[PDB]
Design a protein around this ligand. Structure first.
Ligand code: MN
Ligand code: MN
Ligand code: MN
Ligand code: MN
Ligand code: MN
Ligand code: MN
Ligand code: MN
Ligand code: MN
Ligand code: MN
Ligand code: MN
Ligand code: MN
Ligand code: MN
Lengths: 440, 4, 440, 440, 440, 4, 4, 4
């Protein structure tokens, strides 16, 4: 699945529709980033720039100009075609093919932006710019505005009003279109298949990074070259480190391994976490903690629907957690008192859900304490977890256990659709999967 | 994962 | 294989040995880099910082202070241990374990560098700083020097002499120690195994990125999580694009595929290029170009030894190339005249070799036109290639052919050792390898 | 005369009245400026900051917050009282006396601005800031906005709209109040008295800077310590250099001396130019050029009134100039043709008038080619002049003559009031003045 | 008196003589500084730049290149002659006349510095640059060095060593040549004449700024257009504010007035302080404090000679002060104990002397606590003073008294020469002077 | 003076 | 690869 | 004056 040219047009028009008359929106591409000396990291386009173009090149600027409610045109600044540069650093789109390829009215060379931008802003009343987003963008924009401000004798005028378009554009990104939901759906499938692979390949003696290797390769087999975030493979006590990325230890028989990995498909993020036994068999202690986390997830999956909020569902999860922890002797006291004291905090110290989209931790207003009412089209994760420190003062069998189970869902008219349920999470199903794979 |  | 604590000590001492008395060398770690929004690229330590520590954390500064020819001490600035930050973004070394772990005399919190650095520089005559390397480092250093310059009433004095240590440190990196050569040797083995995999997995119908996937996974199986540079898989006309990284096309029966990929093992780079037929069988036209490139490589491999230079060996390669191109009718005229005219330039437009080490395009002075005399310990690549544009005015069968064959070598006392010969390059051997793999 | 506390209040309210509800205007003071090493130039408050406060200290920020059409409050950030700093660098206002002294609702220490400003902007929809005016101000404002943008988890929100208040504030400054007109009137008197002194003290053999000395001293005697701009005393050929400030030459019998000098009274600028004979007697050649310039000024003084424009009056001046130049043989041809060709350009290359106020070249929109219709309350200069280069191809007696006569006027209901007519400009009156002074 | 071309040559050669072979010294001019909007403060050349050129223009750079002990050449970067710019902002030197005028080997346009500077530094081993002195200079220098560092393929090399020339150049400025001493001597004469004027013009009812006016005018009459620092005229309690520059109060009969003012002649600073009775007659209380300060000055004037130090003479002054304060009842206790406690500190809180030269607070190393041994050629001020706060807990008649008496001296072979003794300081002489002037 |  |  |  993918995003059509029409969709890109719709998005631009939807932004223009909210812009004042006599204004221009400036959206800059992400700059290239050095990995070491003269080598660069694989390029990653700025999410917002990508959202409006699907164009994967740096040194590009999208200019949306609105004359009035029925008139608006676009200008794209991008790298000029250069026989030399291209024979070296890959083919470039250029000005000639840009208009048709990206559906823009006009295309100019990025090398001429300082000679052209002020001319496009001259006479307008408002300019939409994400100030502070990129240093190079601010230089270009500030330089253009200064020329207009100081050019009264040349009859130039600078728009006195500058508005940050991030709030409006991110509000748009918060609601996925059918096309986006289709792409995210494929991202979930690919990511799930990867997690299934990891579970089937896992064997005591293998290192954490080995599972990382299996996962990244599965992403690649389906057209998702890069992960949407650095893969986490924490076995044993490493499972208690929320963003453990070293993945440098030997996985040990008897430990659990927590894998949080997600592919990036057509710019969209998959985000799954599955915790399972390295030897394919949950111990009683591991099961007792796992069950609490799984119930939290399953209940949350049942509750999420339009009308509720992340804050409200989180309340149910906290109750489930405090109750289970008390039954196991990890927490002592009255459930309700413990809840009012957030006694679960030492074991579940992060949120239950976050928006998901072009960025794994997607943009969009959450509202105070993430109280915003959910509506159809919003995409989010559901990731309860329990992490018991190696030195926690609880029964020995629970110390050093880190478990998280995370699925990605899209809110629908009547509830939600689980995009990542194709990879098992019920203990009996996880063991069966691993046992079946081990017959080879 | 966990919101950073 | 790996780098021992002793080696790190030796390197620091070797740098101190070249420093003036009453001076301090400041070596900064690489800053973290954003991939998108709140997600970062996997961390990559600055090569020079790594060379002296093998420490993989950002916000760290190594300070080497030389009192005189027999007295010198070290101070490391690094992130303080924080229960919160670590439960989230991985374990930190901290000040307590640093001295023993990294073999430094003292360790202070990076958060206090602006309150401590000027005190360490006060009274010295010289400070070694790679000015312009990192903006954050320059702020810290300039801030410290200003405090000393303006603090005469507090009896503070700033070293009036600032020296860039890059020339001296890179000259050191230019010559590998036995330990380094052992690590690079393993890097070559791992990289070679990956290229062998790609050749064995290749089938018409597969996409370029699929081979990228096989390669990266093989790197990972042997402990090399990341590539030393972005993998290049150019099939067909894509082979004519020197740094083609899109790897987005379907590999076609009848085309050649050029793969340039290298792992990063213990910070060191492998760098191999192998071009082969997608269908496992070289056509006559493909063979005629391949042979010229292979002869260039084999001859170069025979010539490289102490006493010669990259410039000199390149001369032999140019002769081989011009001769072969004339025999095929791609070039017309007298060999020697064509050579004097660099008539090969349109088909071989890059260098034959580059230093190799902690950076794929390693540091070190090449001398005018890369004329520097080679000595034992230098590590470099040998990568001749011929690229015939799709629209080149030559016999049709040669248009759109891109071939490069690259090996990594270390200059020895009597010649050189090929670190990447474990992956075949002779045509008959490439076809045999592929035919054997295709019986499955 | 002076500006009352009430007036300062009125100005702030007039700005607030034009601001959107739920917004704040940030007006920064001018930074101190180094003259050499540790010595500073006498402090000069930013004109706009002064306009709203009359407060002469650096490191001060006026914050005007508008809740709605009937609710608004102010916060002043200024230097805290410090026994040490004051015993050295003069008395400071401080937070305690500020509210009453400057009529502001609240006063905070400038040292705490980064801890307080974001709190004052939190929740607002619009912030008025003169971006690019001062680097230090931009750092403070950008820093505050970033804290709000990144503090969603702390329930902070940053105003997404930033508006430059310079256009609106300068439009206000363009129209003087009765109090301002009274102050400017005194500025004109003081400046005129100075020019009269210069004419009475001038003698061949004296240097240009000597007249500068007399002028500055006269400014000082009346309470105007500093000039509103660097004094110009160009005698002989120096009169052809528009902004000649060296004033280093010996004034010679036979030459004319052009003096352009203006005092700065209560922040307001006087701006007068008078050209006269060093020996007190105009030669025929000098008179022929002077008369053309004087007629230009006198006619302009008669024409300026509401309804006309600088552009229109300039047209009359150009006609007067071209006509006079043709009669003298400096220009040859048809008056109207020469006019259409701007043939006067080589001799009169600057504008006839500029706004006058807190800045000698005051703020305010001029309109294309200074075509804006004049209205009561506007204050401007009237300064025609003719400058004939030493090597101009005209009759020898005119080469090297530079003459400018400038008065300051305020547009009234029916015409204009000349604020600087108290210093003579008619040739017979200039000679009489000088002859009378020379009897001593 | 003045500085000869020969002297400027000598200075450059003296700096080159201390530079390493194969190096270049870069000395930048001071940038223009805004006073308000489009008006600038009178230009003040950077002291060090002036020291080597006597050239009063901004956007100029002196480049001294040393090949070896007997070979060195100079290159000056300065503004190109422009008919337009000059007819407006004064005449420019230009490239043609520069070599002869300033005695430099070659002159290039400042507009081409970024295209020329790196070429002048290419191949050198050392560059002398006052890093941090000016932001624009650092940009130019850093830009040039980066081009050289990144231009190895173009055979460019950047000097790896950067040395701050401020320590060496300021050490040179610390010792005045006979020519400089002659100029400073004239500066002292001019400044003294000004202070005599102030004393003769002073009358109760006049404002502090009025005396400022008389002083500045006297400076101007003798060719010193600007003061070397902002004039201080503190009468009454204002005399207790060390750097009181407001000079806004009415001088009152019965009060003392402290005047600290100095002219700037040919770039050199005069620096005199004289305190006297507004009504021309010292009261008993005023005399008792004045005498202590005068004795401090007279004794210091007798002691200063080669071999002693500012620290040592200060010790004698402290004794004189503590003794006198005890006799008056302002201090109570044993003289020696009070001294050991620095009990004078509340009344004399600044230093007794500071270097004097191109900057009123001249450059040069003072040594810990200003202990450096004095040698012939050093020029310094001698300025003891006593300041008794309005609310000091001492006998009422002493509260609110501020007195300082300052002279400028040059250390000679056997002692010192007072450059400012031409303006009286003995009480009987001050009263006589004023009484004589009041007969008019 | 003259507008700069 | 090819020296960049 | 007084050293600043
Ligand atoms: Mn356990
Ligand atoms: Mn996750
Ligand atoms: Mn997540
Ligand atoms: Mn073909
Ligand atoms: Mn003449
Ligand atoms: Mn008193
Ligand atoms: Mn004027
Ligand atoms: Mn004017
Ligand atoms: Mn390669
Ligand atoms: Mn290579
Ligand atoms: Mn002084
Ligand atoms: Mn002094």
């Amino acid at each position: 699945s993918e995003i059509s040219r029409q969709e890109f047009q719709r998005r631009r028009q939807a932004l223009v529709e909210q812009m004042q008359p006599g204004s221009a929106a400036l959206i800059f591409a992400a700059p290239e980033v050095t990995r070491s000396a003269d080598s660069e990291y694989p390029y990653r386009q700025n999410s917002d720039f990508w959202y409006f173009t699907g164009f994967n090149e740096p040194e590009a600027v999208l200019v949306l100009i609105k004359s009035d409610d029925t008139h608006n045109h676009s200008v794209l600044f991008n790298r000029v075609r250069d026989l030399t540069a291209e024979i070296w650093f890959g083919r470039r789109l250029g000005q000639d093919a840009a208009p048709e390829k990206l559906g823009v009215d006009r295309a100019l060379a990025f090398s001429e932006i300082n000679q052209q931008l002020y001319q496009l802003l001259n006479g307008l009343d408002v300019v939409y710019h994400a100030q502070g987003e990129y240093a190079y963008a601010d230089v270009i924009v500030n330089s253009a505005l200064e020329k207009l401000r100081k050019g009264s004798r040349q009859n130039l005028t600078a728009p006195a009003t500058m508005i940050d378009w991030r709030p409006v554009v991110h509000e748009m990104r918060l609601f996925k279109s059918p096309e986006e939901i289709a792409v995210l759906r494929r991202a979930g499938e690919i990511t799930a298949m990867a997690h299934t692979r990891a579970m089937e390949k896992c064997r005591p003696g293998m290192f954490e990074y080995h599972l990382e290797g299996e996962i990244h390769h599965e992403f690649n087999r389906h057209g998702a070259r890069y992960p949407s975030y650095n893969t986490i493979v924490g076995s044993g006590e490493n499972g208690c480190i929320l963003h453990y990325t070293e993945n440098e230890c030997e996985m040990r028989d008897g430990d659990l391994v927590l894998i949080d990995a997600g592919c990036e498909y057509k710019g969209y993020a998959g985000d799954i976490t599955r915790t399972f036994p390295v030897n394919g068999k949950f111990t009683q202690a591991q099961r007792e903690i796992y069950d609490i986390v799984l119930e939290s997830l399953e209940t949350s999956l049942r509750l999420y629907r339009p009308g509720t909020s992340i804050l409200e569902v989180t309340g149910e999860v906290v109750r489930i957690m405090v109750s289970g922890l008390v039954k196991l002797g990890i927490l002592k006291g009255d459930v309700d008192e413990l809840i009012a004291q957030n006694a679960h905090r030492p074991f579940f110290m992060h949120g239950l859900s976050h928006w998901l989209g072009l960025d794994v931790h997607d943009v969009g207003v959450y509202g105070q304490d993430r109280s915003r009412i959910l509506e159809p089209g919003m995409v989010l994760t559901v990731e309860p977890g329990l992490y018991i420190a190696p030195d926690a003062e609880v029964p020995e069998q629970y110390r050093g256990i880190g478990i998280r189970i995370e699925d990605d869902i899209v809110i629908t008219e009547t509830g939600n659709e689980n995009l990542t349920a194709s990879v098992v999470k019920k203990p009996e199903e996880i063991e069966a999967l691993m046992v079946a794979a081990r017959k080879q | 994962x966990p919101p950073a």
